[PDB]
Amino acid sequence: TATVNELSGIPAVDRAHVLQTALSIYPEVENWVAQFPVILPQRMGGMCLGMVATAPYAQPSVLVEASIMALIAFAIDDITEDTLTVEQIEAMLTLCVKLVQSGGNSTYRDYPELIQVFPTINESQPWVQLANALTKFCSEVQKFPAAAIYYSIFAKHFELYREAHCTELHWTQAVKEMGSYPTYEQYLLNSRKSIAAPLVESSLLAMVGEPVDSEFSLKPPYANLETLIDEVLLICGSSIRLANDIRSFEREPQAYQPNSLLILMLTQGCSQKEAEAILLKEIDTYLQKIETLISLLPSSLSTWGDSARRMSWFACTWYQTRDFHNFNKQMLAALR
Structure with a gap:
């Protein structure tokens, strides 16, 4: 049930160029997200590949950063819909905004009034890690x-x-x-x-x-x-x-x-x-x-x-297809 408009309007992708660039940024995103293993997806091949397909002639710095933000947002979606109470979810979301508004100049420890609802604040906790990832990203x-x-x-x-x-x-x-x-x-x-x-x-x-x-x-x-x-x-x-x-x-x-x-x-x-x-x-x-x-x-x-x-276009038309699934499989093959 593609429509005429979708059949005719889907943007083009130079797969070779997009795959080469996704492979090139992958180690950089991998080393970044390795610091926050409890909460960030550690498989991010398809994410990188998609982010390059989205902005294919952006500078690598941009593709790395944007891929990181996508992983962070996936993790926020994860930890807000899928262990935590509604109060704790609300607290985490408020915290995220404050960290963002600070531009990297604040950490979760600046907001005890929000984080008092959590049973621990150790550096293994998913929400701590998420907070720190956001601090880091905002500063960058x-x-x-x-x-x-x-x-x-x-x-x-x-x-x-x-x-x-x-x-x-x-x-x-x-x-x-x-x-x-x-x-x-x-x-x-x-x-x-x-x-x-x-x-x-x-x-x-x-x-x-x-x-x-x-x-x-x-x-x-x-x-x-x-x-x-x-x-x-x-x-x-x-x-x-x-x-x-x-x-x-x-x-x-x-x-x-x-x-x-x-x-x-x-x-x-x-x-x-x-x-x-x-x-x-x-x-x-x-x-x-x-x-x-x-x-x-x-x-x-x-x-x-x-x-x-x-x-x-891609999120609605491309990423759920076997075609994209296959391209993903080509990236994973290339990563070994």
Whole structure:
């Protein structure tokens, strides 16, 4: 059920070049994530490969950093949905934001008021390790020239990601107590922001974004540049949320947690196939919209925009295929 638009619009990939570059950055990401073994995925081949496919002519420094952010966001997703209480999850999320807002200048030990809810703070704990990884990453981003203009975007979207996660816990609690759900529209508005891809693309902006003379360079219909950048991140996340939601539901249909497929079945009377078919078209529309939006960027952001476009397309169309699975297998073969 690819659509015409998806068949015709999927961005191209020079697999040789992308594989060569993914192999080249892999040892660097491996040595980084080795420091935080309890919480970061130690298999990251496919992640690197995907990040290069997303930004294929970025500088290696950028590909390493962005791959690291993707692993960190995977781990946050992990430790927030999959041992910990809701209070502890909320605490961890607040902590993450504060560490981000500090730019690397703070550590988890600066926030005892948050970490008092944990039964230990030793350096084996997953959430400690996550905190330290984020400190480290934030300090490294601060060294990128683009960070003096664009870091705030990353920090703001990190706050929205926390907020979206918090709302989702509140909705889940309500499901257990009340059996009731947000509407599809309420759900997507929130949960477009609670996935990794958003975070990663915002961090990418703080690595690659160039100065824009907003005053004189912005064109109608955007009177401020922040809104456009926001929109690209929201629309990136909207397509990916829906695709992830289909995957999650398929793997555990009996799950009760707010999920857009489940919501359409429970709240709008759809069969699973009807539900899936509405999500698939929405996905298509949001892939069309991100193409429109990225076409509107100032030329000094068009390279960032293209990463956000690639990320959404691949996350929705490519990464779940056997084709991608196979390319992954080629990377793993090459790593031995």
